[PDB]
Amino acid sequence: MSTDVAAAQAQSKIDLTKKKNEEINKKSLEEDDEFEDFPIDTWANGETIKSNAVTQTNIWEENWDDVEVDDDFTNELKAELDRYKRENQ
Amino acid sequence: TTAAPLLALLRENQDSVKTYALESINNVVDQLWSEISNELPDIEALYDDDTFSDREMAALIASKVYYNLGEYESAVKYALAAKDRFDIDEKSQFVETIVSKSIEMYVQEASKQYTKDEQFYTKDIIDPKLTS
């Protein structure tokens, strides 16, 4: 979410009457939340959600199995292929 | 606007063009002080030369740049090395900081020179300019 534990820094900073004006000044420097352009350009985004469920949309601990495919199906072919060559060598 | 031409005119070789450089730098220095802070030795070089009578105009610029820099003590020395066009800034209340720094310096010096003799301002013990 943000650089560090993001949980530790959300609770350190909350709204006070002094702070509310500063949030508006920060927002207005760039002019809006900068969070509307992406909905507009794509017109209903399409993210990486197909590969697996540890992907961009994820609400659980990552498995780190989105940078690599399942190699077990390959291993099925490799194990058989070895036995054949092995046999007549 | 930009300091790039004003830096380049000091480096451009012709005596008239170097004098023209000073003229531009001195007029606009509250937006361009940062760039010409680095190229200060060129401003001191033209002041050293006796082939100019705007050697003073260069000394005046040096004080101005030091005032924006934050080095108020060294500005005084180059303010008094221009010698004229400093009355223009003695009646300026937005830069009377350098005018006041000369008096702050005088007080520290004077505590020393009173133990040499009670008179040091009717004698040459200190700069004549600081007394005046």
């Binding site: - | 606007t1 930009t2 380049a8 005119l9 451009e12 063009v17």
Partner: protein
Amino acid sequence: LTKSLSIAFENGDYAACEKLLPPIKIELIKNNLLIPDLSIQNDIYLNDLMITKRILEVGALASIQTFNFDSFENYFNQLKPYYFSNNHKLSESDKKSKLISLYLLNLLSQNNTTKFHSELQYLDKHIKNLEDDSLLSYPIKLDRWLMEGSYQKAWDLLQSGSQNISEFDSFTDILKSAIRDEIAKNTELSYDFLPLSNIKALLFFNNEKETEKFALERNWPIVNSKVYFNNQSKEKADYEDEMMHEEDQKTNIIEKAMDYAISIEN
């Protein structure tokens, strides 16, 4: 008088430019007074701006053509704000596109890469697609190959860069040397010796006798046709130990322990 510089560039006599400039330099101040240096722009100032700009541009190319790189640096600085300030109705030239290509090569040849990236950030909005990269490709693509580390592709763009002459050869020939020194540094770390033949290919020469003479002057001995990169590195390192600033930069053991106790005890 002022118009003679403009027609002198057309001759092709570019040293005749420099010897004619000094009077034009004093007459250029008078041109600068006509424009306010664009703190307001009007249509009376528009015809004057072409006059002020024209004298800078022809001097800029003439100085590079006599190999006065210092003079060129000053001309570019003066010229830049004039393109910079205003809505376009005279803020470009046929010469501008060529001009920026030459300044970018000058920073690469002196190997001030820090200012090469800062300058192109500022340039980016004048050449994005408005003067689009059409000759500027030459320093930019070269920079791509040098960031990647492909000295190979970088060498080829220089080789094929002599077919097209605008005036770029005055910096192409410097850049050929810059590449050798950079490769010369990197190869010290890699290993301690290359045969002579393997040096000539990597450091880009056309004579084996050039290869060996370059080594001697750089303080590598070629003894039994093996270079000893490690000589110069020892020699540089010795020099550093020979000057003395040195005890505290490395920080003795005693010094560290002294520091701890006195921080506490204040």
